[PDB]
Swiss-Prot record, chain A:
Protein name according to UniProt: Envelope glycoprotein H
Record keyword Transcription present: no
Subunit organization: Interacts with glycoprotein L (gL); this interaction is necessary for the correct processing and cell surface expression of gH. The heterodimer gH/gL seems to interact with gB trimers during fusion. The heterodimer gH/gL interacts with host EPHA2 to facilitate virus internalization and fusion. Interacts with glycoprotein 42/BZLF2.
Organism: Epstein-Barr virus (strain B95-8) (HHV-4)
Transcription found in the keyword field: no
UniProtKB/Swiss-Prot annotation, chain B:
Annotated function: The heterodimer glycoprotein H-glycoprotein L is required for the fusion of viral and plasma membranes leading to virus entry into the host cell. Acts as a functional inhibitor of gH and maintains gH in an inhibited form. Upon binding to host integrins, gL dissociates from gH leading to activation of the viral fusion glycoproteins gB and gH. Fusion of EBV with B-lymphocytes requires the additional receptor-binding protein gp42, which forms a complex with gH/gL. The heterodimer gH/gL targets also host EPHA2 to promote viral entry.
Coverage span on the entire protein: 24 to 131 of 137
Gene that this sequence comes from: gL
Topology class, membrane: Peripheral membrane protein
Gene Ontology cellular-component terms listed: host cell Golgi apparatus; host cell plasma membrane; membrane; viral envelope; virion membrane
Keyword field: Disulfide bond, Fusion of virus membrane with host cell membrane, Fusion of virus membrane with host membrane, Glycoprotein, Host cell membrane, Host Golgi apparatus, Host membrane, Membrane, Signal, Viral envelope protein, Viral penetration into host cytoplasm, Virion, Virus entry into host cell
Region annotation Interaction with gH: where it falls in the sequence: 1-105
Similarity field: Belongs to the herpesviridae glycoprotein L family.
Species whose genome carries this gene: Epstein-Barr virus (strain B95-8)
Major localization listed first in the record, in broad terms: virion
Protein name, UniProt field: Envelope glycoprotein L
Oligomeric form and interacting partners: Interacts with glycoprotein H (gH); this interaction is necessary for the correct processing and cell surface expression of gH. The heterodimer gH/gL seems to interact with gB trimers during fusion. The heterodimer gH/gL interacts with host EPHA2 to facilitate virus internalization and fusion.
Cysteines engaged in disulfide bonds, as pairs: 5-33, 6-56
Amino acid sequence: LSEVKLHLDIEGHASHYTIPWTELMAKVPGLSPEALWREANVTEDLASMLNRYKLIYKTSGTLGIALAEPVDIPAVSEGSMQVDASKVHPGVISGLNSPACMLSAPLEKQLFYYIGTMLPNTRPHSYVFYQLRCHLSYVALSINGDKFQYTGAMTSKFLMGTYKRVTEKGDEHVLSLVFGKTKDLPDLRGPFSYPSLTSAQSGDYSLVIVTTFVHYANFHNYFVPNLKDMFSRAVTMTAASYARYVLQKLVLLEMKGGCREPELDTETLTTMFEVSVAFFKVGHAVGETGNGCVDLRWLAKSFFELTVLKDIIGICYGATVKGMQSYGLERLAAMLMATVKMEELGHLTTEKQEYALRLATVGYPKAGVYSGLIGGATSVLLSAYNRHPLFQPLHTVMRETLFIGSHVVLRELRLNVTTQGPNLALYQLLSTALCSALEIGEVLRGLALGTESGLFSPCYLSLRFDLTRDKLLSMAPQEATLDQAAVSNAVDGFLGRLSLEREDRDAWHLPAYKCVDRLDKVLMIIPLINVTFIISSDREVRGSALYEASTTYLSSSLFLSPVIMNKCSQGAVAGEPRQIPKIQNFTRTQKSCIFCGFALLSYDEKEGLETTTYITSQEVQNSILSSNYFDFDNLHVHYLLLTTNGTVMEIAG
Amino acid sequence: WAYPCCHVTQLRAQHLLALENISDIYLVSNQTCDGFSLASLNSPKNGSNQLVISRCANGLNVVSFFISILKRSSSALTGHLRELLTTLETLYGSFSVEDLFGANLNRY
C-alpha cells in the first residue's frame, strides 16, 4: 500500500526505483492503481497468457509513409472578441465583419460533454487494452436490422471505430480500427506491442487493427479496406475538406441506391470509418490548441460540414451522432446573425456571403425562432438568379454558396410553423426556374464524366416533379463522346438523390397544395405573386380555370390549373378545357417590365416540360428577349406565359 | 544478473495478493532466465521484514501495468518516475513472446 519499489537490471547493474502511487493518487483523478493491477492478470500462468495473445490479428505488412499534418486553425486575428462557450452574454458582443474566436478550454468541454468507454468489455478488446474511461463522443450505426453495426467512438486524442456483424446464429464477429497520434494510443495490457498491430504509420500518426484471427477471416470476405489511402487522406487534409470528401463519398453511395439497399461492401464500410474520422478531425483540432482560440470563421466552416454530414448520415442510415455539438457555438452564431441586414445579404460580397449563410446553419437550432434567417438565404439566392439565365456555372464559387443556404431553408420547410411561407415559397419558385433543361442537362453531363459529385442542385428544392427515369434521360446530352452506359448511371443517380433530398411535404406549406386531388399526376407547380399555377396531366385540380396545350404526343395531356388568390373553388372546371391563345403582338425591345410578376414555361411537343422562368426584375426580362431564349423557328418547342391572372398564352413574336 | 526464476501457477478458487500488501518487485532481463519475462512479488508479513512472502507473477503483464500507470499520470512526475518509464518500456520490448510457442514453459 502507498509505497512500492521495484528492482531492475540494466547492464550488470541493479537499478532501484520506488513508485509511491500514494502521492500519485492525490495529484491524479482517474488513476485507480487497484483496478489496473487486477485488470492485468499478474498470476497468469506462463502458458495461458500466450494463447490470449496469438488469438489476435497481426498487422503483417505494417507499412507507413511521409505524412506531415496540414495547417488547420489560423492564429487568432487582431481584436478578435474571444468568448467563452460555457455561457453566452445576455446580449451581443460582435457585429458581422468584426474579428472573433472561441476559447478551446470551454468549447472542448462542451463538445466532449458525454463520458464513456473507449474500450468496451467485449472479449476481443478486454484482451488487448486496459479498460479506459474519459469524455468522448460516438457515431451509432445499425444496418440489416441490428445484424450489423458500427460505432465511431472518439475522444479528444484518438478515434476507435468497431465493426460488428452477426451470422444467422448467435455468432458475433468484431474488428476495430484505431486512429490518432502514435503518442496518444491507449495502453496495451498483456504481451502486446503496437508495431505488431499498427497498419500504417506517419512521423506521429498510426492506424491500429484490433481483432482476432477468427474474426479477421469472416471480415476479410467482404471488407478489404485500402488502409494506405484511407490513412493518408485521414492525416494530410484539413478538417473542413475531409468532412466534404466524406460527404461526397456518401452522396455517391446514395446515387448507388446504397441508402435503401445498404450494401455491406468495402466501400460502404470504409466510408463509415471515414465519417467518424471527419468528426474526430474537428475534435482533435480544438484539442491540439488547448487554452487557445479558434477563429469563428473556422468553426462556421468546419462545424458546418459536420451538420450537413450528420443529416445525410441519418437520412441514409439510421445512424446517430452525439458529443460534437456545443450549445455555446450555436448561441453565439445565432446572436451574431440576429445583428445583420439579412434582407440585404445578397448585395454583400462572396466570401462574406458564404460565412454568413454558413454559420446561419450552425446557429439555426439554439436560437432564431423569429430571426430573419430564411430571409437572408432568399436574398443571397435572389441575387444569384438575377445575374444569370436559369443555370449556375457548374463549378462557380457561388454554386457552393446556394448549397450552404439551401440547408437552412430545407430545415425551415420541414417544420409545421408557417413562418415566412411567402418568403420561402419564393425560394422554391426561383430554384424551380433554375432547374431548367440546361441545368438538369449539365448536371448529368458532369455526373457521367465524373466532374460533378452531384452534391447540390436547385432542383433538390424546386417544385419540378416532372423529371422521371425517362424524362431525365431526355435532357441528357446526346453525344458519342459520352459513354451511353455511364450516362444511364448518372440519370439513375440523380433521380435517386432527388427522391431522398426532396420530400412530399416540402410543399405542405404552399397554399395551393390543398387543391390537388390526383397529386401524383402533377408535373410542376409554379407559386406566383397573386396566384399559383399547377401543371399536371389531370384536369382534377380545382383551381379557377383549365388550360390544355395543343400537344398530345405525351402519354397523357398537358393541363394548366391556376389557383387565383391561392384559394380554390369546389369542384373542377366544366367540360372542355380553355385553349391556349397564340400571340405575336408583343415586340422584342421593351421599355418597361411587362412580364414582371409573370413566368415563362417552355415545353417540347415530344418530351415533357423543358425550362421555366420567373422574370424577377427588368434586367432579367432584357437578358431573355435579347438572348436567344426564344426559338419560334422550331415547331417542336412552344413558349407559354403565365400571368398574375389565371390567364395563359403562347408566344411567337 | 538477477534472482531465481520460477514456475508461475494460477491460484484457483482461493484469494490473491493485492497491491495493499505488496511493496517489492524484482524483474528479470531478456537473457537472465530464458526469455521468460518473470517478476517476483515480495510483501512483508505480520509487521516489518520478519517473514517475507515471495510469489511469482508474469513479468510482461506486471511491467505493462507499471508502464501504463506512469503514462497515465505523466502530468505529475519527474526525476526517476520519468526515466523509469523510458527504461521500463525498452525492457518491455526486449522480450520476445512468439518464441515461447516452441519453448518449454515448464523449464522452472
